[PDB]
Amino acid sequence: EALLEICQRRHFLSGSKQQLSRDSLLSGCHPGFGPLGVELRKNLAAEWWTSVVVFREQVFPVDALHHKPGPTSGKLRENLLHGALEHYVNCLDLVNKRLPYGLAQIGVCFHPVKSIGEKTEASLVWFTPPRTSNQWLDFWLRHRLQWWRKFAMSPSNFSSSDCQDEEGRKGNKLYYNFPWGKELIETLWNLGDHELLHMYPGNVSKLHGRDGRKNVVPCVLSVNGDLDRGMLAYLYDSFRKVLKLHPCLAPIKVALDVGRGPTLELRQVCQGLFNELLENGISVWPGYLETMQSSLEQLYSKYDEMSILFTVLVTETTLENGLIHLRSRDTTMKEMMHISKLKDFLIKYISSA
Amino acid sequence: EALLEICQRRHFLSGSKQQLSRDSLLSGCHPGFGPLGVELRKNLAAEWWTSVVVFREQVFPVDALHHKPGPLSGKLRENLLHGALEHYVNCLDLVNKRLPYGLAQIGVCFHPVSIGEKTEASLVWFTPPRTSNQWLDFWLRHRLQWWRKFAMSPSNFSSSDCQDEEGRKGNKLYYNFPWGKELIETLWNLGDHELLHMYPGNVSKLHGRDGRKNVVPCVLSVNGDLDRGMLAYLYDSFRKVLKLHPCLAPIKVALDVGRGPTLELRQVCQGLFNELLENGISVWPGYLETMQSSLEQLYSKYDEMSILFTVLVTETTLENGLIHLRSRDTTMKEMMHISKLKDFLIKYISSA
Amino acid sequence: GQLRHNPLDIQMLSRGLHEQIFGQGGEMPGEAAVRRSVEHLQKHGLWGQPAVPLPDVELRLPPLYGDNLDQHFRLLAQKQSLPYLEAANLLLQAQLPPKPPAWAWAEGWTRYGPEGEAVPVAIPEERALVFDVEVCLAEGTCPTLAVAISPSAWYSWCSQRLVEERYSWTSQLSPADLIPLEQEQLVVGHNVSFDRAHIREQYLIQGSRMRFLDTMSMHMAISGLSSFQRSLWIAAKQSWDWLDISSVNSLAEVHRLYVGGPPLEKEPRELFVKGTMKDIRENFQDLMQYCAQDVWATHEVFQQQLPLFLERCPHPVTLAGMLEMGVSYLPVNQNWERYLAEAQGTYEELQREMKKSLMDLANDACQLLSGERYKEDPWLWDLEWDLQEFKQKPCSEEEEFQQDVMARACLQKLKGTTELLPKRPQHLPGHPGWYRKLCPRLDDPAWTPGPSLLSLQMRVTPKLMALTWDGFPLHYSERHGWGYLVPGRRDSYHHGNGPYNDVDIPGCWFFKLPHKDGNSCNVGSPFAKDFLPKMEDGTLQAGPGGASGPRALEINKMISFWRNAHKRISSQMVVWLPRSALPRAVIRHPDYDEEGLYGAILPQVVTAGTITRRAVEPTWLTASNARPDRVGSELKAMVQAPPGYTLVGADVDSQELWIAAVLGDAHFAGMHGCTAFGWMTLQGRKSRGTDLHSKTATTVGISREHAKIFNYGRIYGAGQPFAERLLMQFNHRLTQQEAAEKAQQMYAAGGTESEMFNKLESIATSDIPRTPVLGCCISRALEPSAVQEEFMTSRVNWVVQSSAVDYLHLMLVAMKWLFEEFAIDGRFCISIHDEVRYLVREEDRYRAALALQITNLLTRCMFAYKLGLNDLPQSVAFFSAVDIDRCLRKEVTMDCKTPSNPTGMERRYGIPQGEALDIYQIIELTKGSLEK
DNA sequence: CGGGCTCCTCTAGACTCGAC
DNA sequence: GTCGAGTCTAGAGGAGCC
Ligand SMILES: Nc1ccn([C@H]2C[C@H](O)[C@@H](COP(=O)(O)OP(=O)(O)OP(=O)(O)O)O2)c(=O)n1
Ligand SMILES: [Ca+2]
């Protein structure tokens, strides 16, 4: 229970031990995350969005409403597949009826638990010709598994399984090996044209995409992942008490502190460095604004439990030679670096991670 | 009228040509946003986050749920203030009970109209009552400056001072649409009524350090509609052209091919596309098109899609590296080397 | 009836084929020979064993040309190699004018007449040439310039990419980007296989009559050296009579050995291997002059070598096979690029998974520096833990703006104190010594955070993982390699590789880790494949425990081959044929993919790169077969026939075993099966799993490939310790005593293999050792008059290996004759040392299989004939199976499921499984005839 | 007395070269 | 004008094929 104590203490999670049991975390009935948890989830969502949408010429964002109206009362959505399927005909015009193309979305889905649990899910409705549906399913399985493994200290804890639906439709499921057992984190299903034909009864001419020179009704490939359970899995994978989160997923990158006097000038130096690192896209923890002085060892432990990559220290000597102290979480070793070469080094460390 | 048609064709707004309307767009009952509209809203959210939360040490993100359970039979949230107020006590520990501090969040809020979903950007500001009006004016000025920053005609982004029924001072931000003035953001000086109501008794837990003395803080509520802001910017940006601000425009560079051979030009375009993506520039893969249309038609299509520049790669690119570069704003063509395109785009976006 | 037998009851060739091959009549074996054979087999207990007769085969073989088989083969070889011999003679008596004063600067081919006149020509238009090609390695694989020597005039070629400078060319090569050449033409070069790959017309699917001759292959044939001999020659340059008449395959050394004029000049700058295109365009004249000098040296060497090669290899079959082995063709498609990408991606993912654990262990080990706790860790106490000092020589809008400006100005002023710091940045001064080495420097373009320069092969990885052998920590000794320390010296209860007192670590004894090749060898990495059984047995235990150690060894095995082969495989030169260059049969076939790319890879094969005249190729003769664990092991499976074509090939069954057995049988009494070893070789079918390799694999539970290694080692001089080490390595269930007992039983000899050893020794100790079949002499640097008694094992193995090379030459000649005679639309694809693959059309696959079977029959009959025997057993008369597959793999049934290709060939690439056919099925399908 | 090849990574040693 | 970091090279051990 040490990890949950750290998460409560370091504001990854909100509430107490009553609201933060394993079942509550895995169900979605827990209170919201803390600011560090929100930042970690945002980093995870940004990495997913980059890898899935940014470096793809055919994957477009989609906006699905949180509620489904009409047949008389409406309902809250439980999956992102339906809303994306509602936009297939409209999004055909973007690719000029070319296939394959996908619609991606990250949002909150409401799952009954009667308590209502909220889960943040990332969807990818991948319309493909039936000829290469299995190849695309295997490619996406490998891609998603590699994506989940590349941010993990132990990639072996992320596994996959082959599954079949009630109608025999092929699919895959991804799991993380939590200390109690494997829990589902992502599910790929190789659906057919059943949902497309049901949602668009009538002529199939409007649903015809182009596979080379052939018009065909695509087979819907749906990839759905759990971002909340994903970040919980990464928190368990990260866990001297240190959360060794990935540099691309750590909520706060650098902790900026200050040494002894003079106070006034060092505050200006720290504020300038803070503004520089902020404008360069680096999340900083302003430890120089804390009047409650603490020992360097205690501050290091606090930053380590918060998944702080580097602890930049600006002392009196910085004013006379420009050198600052940098302690890395990974090695716990202190290095003296010039202040002009901090931003470039941090950007290189984040990008090359 | 014509602007809505352009936004429907260019996939700013989803739905059919009749399913969308002014009242539906304002209320939040429209079918949704197209990919370009989604990217424009995402850019607006990123700009709001940068202006509010990123460059301040007192503002922290909040995680409020869409549903509020318990007796009030759960209900969907209508404001983002209540979640922040519920997180007030715990989030007071991060600052070591120092004042002021803030909690900001962007999320969808549901209002009866039918169900109307509006994405709203909210900031709660916990201050001692001594500096309540000063901070209210500070936030009013900053938010009005932020709204006017991306506007071609910042005169349409008006402001007004209003008094509620109780008698608490507050401001309202407006945009001058072609049919009238529509509210886009509202600030209030709520005081401490809600904080005491949601934490009855034992006011020692609500105490905050205003320097030397412990003070029960006064909450300031800054609430703006990003979807309405997106509509306002689309109307402000509108030869049919949508001159969106470079920091907000969904697609920045359009990459095309001009002639044969297909393979070498395709490889060059793919390399440039990958480089621009790695450098954080949104690119429209127009070179994948099977049948290239007239260059005038492509230019009109990209003008209607708020694309900053269009890059046309031809045989001359293989030989000399020079690529055609058309500017959306000035409709002027130029030829520059393909190795300097990324730096040019980055510097242009930074200057914008 | 067609059934026939011999005095020793061994079934012989069917009469319908014996009357066609060996004719009617001959010399009877006699009486005393049969008596000796019967006594031998009775003493060895093999005379009473009955054998079930194989079904007889009746065929109408193609009409042989000469009066007997040898004349038939000689006529075939002469008709095949006649124009190339006269072209070589034209080059031999050539009159070469001096090189022009100024090399031309133009695109295409230029012909230099007398007095330096340069004329633009489309093609050289010559029957014989001496060729050399220069390629800018930095730019890619497209040729840059070439110099061609003709008996009448000089020729020079310059690429468009060299003459013209563009922003970017096409990385995918095309026939329009190669050297234009090409009724028979001969091209001579020192590594002509490399120069062949740059010819435009050598990549068309349909064949051409141009052949290529090599000078280093002829050097190996005439006066070549073994690898150990090469090393000794290099060491001596910086019994030894063989040094004077031998050299390494370098053009300068060959020219010195055969011509010995002025030493050849080499460009020191190496503007093609280390330079750029601008350097070539600046030093164009000098580089072209060096190329012309190399061509001239090659011409001189060829003139000095051809008579010697014809004298020492007089049989025309050798030359015809060398000419046919030079041409090689491996068709590919768009799946080659996907295979490269998938293999590289899987390798990168597995490498990252491997590096994450090591980086975490290294990072956690840095905390032992605090408090000098490293001097108590048994694994990291002796590392470098030193440290380096850092060497050195609300608010208003206006108020907020001013505060921001002041902070920014203060930051800018501090950043201006760069004058006092040293110019060269220091590399992690604060981290300990062993941690700086593992971390790439910031100026490295491939920089990665953390100790990214770490791997299992490094000497610190076993210390980081705290590997333990039987409860003792691992310790590295420079003199003795990897070992372990047994505590309790107290100036040994444990027994192992030995208590080496040289190391002298206080309080401990050093014991080496056991090695698979004896106590003399030293272990360089405890993560080798041999220690995986020890990892599973629990003798080798990692410090973290669990599966981390076994996972490390598993990933090392998975990525071991690709680590050493990715540069070779990814650098393969592929030329993609356009639509107009494809045959209409490929275009009109249903399998033709319109958006697909169809190309070809020409292996750069040195025809005679071995003292036994075996071919050598860096990649395709070292290409691993598909395995469930190796990454990128489906390399040969990516050689896919074009739409409408199939790959027909076969592997000779127990080639060297049968060659040695037939030599012994002919030496003993002149009949097949005369010797016990020859009788054992004949009594066995591969389909029934009763051959010698399978029999050994059943006697000792090693795999059949392990049985191959065991038998071939025992034949060529392996002793009992080698046999027992192999048994302990391949069968881990055995002990030392069991291996020793199995060593005696498998080596129990007045012996089974006495006649084979006597014949091989007699041929090896001859004044001029020659191949018993084709009469090819040994290298001049291995005759007893040059080496005396040294290199005995090499000389005794050379007879059988060169006999196998003669077998390959005969197979190639026979296949070429059969393909040309009956209009079989196909061509030679590639030949591994005992395999022969042919790219044939779909319509003629069964005719090709019948031709292969006939070729095997003819080659076996020739081998029997040349040794004195006048008959052939039916068992060895045909291939066990002939493969007809769209891709190249060891077996047609297997699907290449590898870490890079987990779905298999049928699913990912749509390659159906092939068919393996015996002679009878081929006869049924072809009606027994090769005609159309 | 296994033989015949092929290539790779890692490590130590000598040489070079730019900066203090 | 000395010396500590690039750079080339030779050697050892390992690993593919026949
Ligand atoms: N370790 C080895 C492997 C091979 N060879 C030689 C002897 C063989 O005659 C020839 C061909 O190798 P194969 O592996 O094909 O051996 P066989 O031809 O005997 O086996 P098979 O009957 O399966 O073809 O290579 C050898 O001397 N030592
Ligand atoms: Ca064989």
* SS (HEC) of C373-408: CHHHCCCCCCCCCCCCCCCCCCCCHHHHHHHHHHHH
A146 plus A286 within the same structural domain: no
- The C-alpha atoms of residue C436 and residue C428 are separated, in whole angstroms, by 6
Of A194, A213, A238, which residue sits at a domain end?
Answer: A238
Q: Are residues B148 and B258 in the same domain?
A: no
Residues A282 and A213 in one domain: no
* Cβ-based neighbour number of residue C45 at 10 Å: 9
Whose CA is closest to C635, among C622, C650, C647, C625? C625
Instruction: Clarify whether residues A131 and A219 are in a common domain.
Output: yes
Whole-number Å distance between alpha carbons of A283 and C470: 49
C-alpha span between C183 and C307 (Å, rounded):
24
**From the candidate CATH numbers 3.10.129.10, 3.40.190.80, 3.30.420.390, 1.10.3720.10, the one assigned to the domain spanning C94-312:** 3.30.420.390
- The helix/strand/coil state of C781 is coil
A:171-200 residues touching chain B, CB 8 A cutoff: none
H-helix segments, chain B: 2-9, 22-27, 35-49, 81-86, 88-91, 132-149, 193-198, 226-236, 262-278, 295-304, 315-320, 341-351
Whether residues B289 and A11 touch (CB distance < 8 A) is answered with no
Closest in A269, A336, A349 to C390, CB measured: A336
**A226 & A322 share domain:** no
Catalytic residue among C70, C132, C504, C629: C132
DSSP strand pairing (B333-337 vs A158-164)? unpaired
> Do A150 and A222 fall into the same domain?
yes
B160 min Cα distance to partner chain A (Å): 32
| Ligand 1 pocket, Cβ-based, cut-off 6 angstroms | C 651-657, 708-709, 712, 804, 833-834
What pairs with residue B186 in β-bridges? B172, B223
| CATH number of the domain that residue B298 is part of | 3.40.50.800
- As annotated, the binding site of C for a 2'-deoxyribonucleoside 5'-triphosphate includes 651-652, 654, 656, 704, 708, 712, 834
Residue B295: CA count within 13 A, CB half-sphere: 14
Residues 6+ apart with CB under 8 A from C355: C452, C454, C455
Cα gap C219→C215, rounded to integer Å: 6
Same domain, B140 and B111: yes
C654 Cα–ligand 1 center, Å: 6
Backbone angles phi, psi at C337, to 5 degrees: -65, -40
Cα distance between residue B139 and residue B150, in whole Å: 18
Among C793, C788, C769, C789, residue whose Cα is nearest residue C779:
C769
**In this structure, how many other beta carbons lie within 10 angstroms of the beta carbon of residue A212?**
11
The kind and range of the H/E element at C91 are: helix C69-92
Q: How far is CA C25 from the centre of its chain?
A: 45
Residue C193 Cβ < 7 Å to strand D: no
Length of chain C: 932
Specify the resolution in Å: 2.7
Residue A120's identity, in one-letter code, is T
Question: Are both A276 and A147 inside the same structural domain?
Answer: no
| Whether the Cβ atoms of residue C711 and residue C693 lie closer than 8 Å to each other | yes
**Per CA to C1' distance, which residue is closest to D10?**
C458
Q: How far is the CA of C257 from the C1' of E6 (A)?
A: 39
Residue carrying structure tokens 């460009």 = C267
CA of C909 to the centre of ligand 2 (A): 29
Classify the C-alpha dihedral C416-C422-C425-C427 as positive or negative. Answer: negative
Residues B223 and B273 in one domain: no
Contact C11, C57 (CB under 8 A): no
Shared-domain flag, residues A171 and A309: no
Nearest CA in chain C to A342: C415
User: How far B135 CA sits from the closest chain C CA (Å)?
Assistant: 6
Burial of C53 (0-12, 13-18, 19+ CB in 10 A): exposed
Is the Cβ–Cβ distance between A330 and A244 less than 8 Å? yes
Nearest to A286 by CA among A269, A261, A264: A269
- C233 C-alpha vs ligand 1 centroid, how far in Å? 30
Which tokens sit at C221?
């044939």
Contact by Cβ (8 Å): A11, A306: no
Report residue B132 as tokens. Answer: 């309540």
Q: Is C767 a catalytic residue?
A: no
Rounded to 5°, the CA angle C890-C895-C896 comes to: 80
Please check whether residue A249 lies inside any domain of the structure: no
User: Helices C655-668 and C792-821 sit at what angle, rounded to 10 degrees?
Assistant: 110
Q: Please report whether residue B243 resides in a domain.
A: no
What angle is formed at CA B264 by the lines to CA B263 and CA B269, rounded to 5 degrees? Answer: 100
Residue B165, C-beta contacts closer than 8 angstroms, at least 6 positions apart: none
Helix (H) or strand (E) holding C931: none
Range of the domain at B264: 253-351
Helix (H) or strand (E) holding C317: helix C316-326
Number of domains in chain B: 2
Residue A13, token pair as written in the block = 């999670």
Cα angle, residue A338 at apex, residues C411 and A269 outer, rounded to 5°: 25
Q: Residue with the nearest Cα to atom 7 of ligand 1?
A: C656
Contact call for residues B7 and B31 (beta carbons, < 8 A)? no
Which two structure tokens, joined as six digits, stand for C689? 């799993």
| CATH number of the domain enclosing B14 | 3.30.930.10
Rounded Cα distance, A210 and A212, in Å: 6
C678 half-sphere exposure, CB direction, 13 A CA radius = 29
**Same domain for B208 and B325:** no
**Dist. CA C389–CA C403, nearest whole Å:** 36
Of the candidates B65, B220, B8, B263, the one whose C-alpha atom is nearest the C-alpha of residue B129 is: B220
Name the closest nucleotide to C792, judged by C1' and CA: D1
- Report if residue B244 sits inside a domain: no
Eight-state DSSP code of residue C199:
B
**CA–C1' distance B23–E12 (Å)?**
81
Q: Where are the alpha helices (DSSP H) in chain A?
A: 2-9, 22-27, 35-49, 81-85, 88-92, 133-149, 194-199, 227-238, 263-279, 296-305, 316-321, 342-351
Contact (Cβ atoms closer than 8 angstroms) between residue C500 and residue C483: yes
Residue B242 lies in a domain: no
Domain boundaries of chain C, sorted by first residue:
15-70+647-675+765-926, 94-312, 686-752
**Greatest pairwise CA separation for chain A in angstroms:** 79
C865 Cα: distance to centroid of ligand 2 (angstroms) = 21
Nearest to B94 among A11, A74, A94 (CB): A11
Q: Tokens 């080698």 belong to which residue?
A: C722
Amino acid at C932: K
Q: Hey, how many other C-beta atoms are within 10 angstroms of the C-beta on C428?
A: 18
d(CA C383, CA C656): 52
Please judge whether C172 and B263 are an interchain contact, meaning their C-beta atoms are less than 8 angstroms apart.
yes
Query: What's the Å distance between residue C470 CA and nucleotide D7 C1'?
Result: 35
Which spans in B33-179 are helix H? 35-49, 81-86, 88-91, 132-149
Residue A245 lies in a domain: no
Paired with A175 in beta bridges are A159, A184
Distance of CA C717 to the CA centre of its chain: 24
Residue C425's nearest CA partner among C439, C440, C442 is C442
Helix (H, G, I), strand (E, B) or coil at C414: helix
Cβ atoms of residues C214 and C191 within 8 Å: yes
Dist. CA C377–CA C371, nearest whole Å: 13
Q: Is residue A248 part of a domain?
A: no
Could you say which of A62, A90, A278 has the minimum Cβ distance to residue B55? Answer: A278
Of the listed ligands, the closest to the CA of C717 is 1
Give C626's contacts (C-beta < 8 A, 6+ positions apart): C633, C634, C636, C637, C889, C890, C894, C896, C897, C898
Question: Does strand D come within 7 Å of the CB of C501?
Answer: no
> What subunits touch chain A, counting only 3 or more CB pairs under 8 A?
B, C
Going by C-alpha positions, the residue among B284, B278, B324 that lies closest to residue B304 is B284
Task: Check whether residue B88 and residue B203 sit in a common domain.
Answer: yes
- CA distance linking residue C688 with residue C178, whole number of Å: 51
In DSSP terms, C154 is beta-bridged to C112, C149
The torsion defined by the Cα of C359, C365, C367 and C369, in degrees rounded to 10, comes to -130
Between CA A107 and CA A123 the distance in angstroms is 8
**Where would I find the H helices in C788-894?**
792-821, 845-866
CB atoms B138 and C171 under 8 Å:
no
* CA distance to A24, B103, C243, per residue, from B84 (Å): 21, 6, 90
Solved with? cryo-EM
**Helix-then-strand count for chain B, H and E:** 12, 16
- Asked if strand D contacts C381 at the CB level, meaning under 7 A, the answer is no
Whether the CB of C424 is less than 7 Å away from nucleic strand D comes out as yes
Instruction: Round to whole Å and give the CA distance between C715 and C670.
Output: 22
In a domain, B247, yes or no: no
Which positions of chain E lie under 7 Å from any protein Cβ? 5-6, 12-18
**Separation between Cα atoms, residue B211 and residue C162, nearest integer Å:** 76
Handedness of CA A349, A350, A351, A352 (dihedral sign): positive
Please report residues of C whose CB lies closer than 8 A to that of A333.
366, 369, 430-431, 435
Rounded-to-integer distance, Cα C314 and Cα B68, Å: 98
Q: Which of B209, B236, B263 is the last residue of a domain?
A: B236
Atom of ligand 1 nearest to the CA of C709: 1
Q: Whose CA is nearest to atom 14 of ligand 1?
A: C708
Q: Which residues of B touch A34 (CB under 8 A)?
A: 63, 90
CA of C413 to the centre of ligand 2 (A): 77
* Residue B212 resides in a domain: yes
Q: For residue C351, give the chain A residue with the closest CA.
A: A150
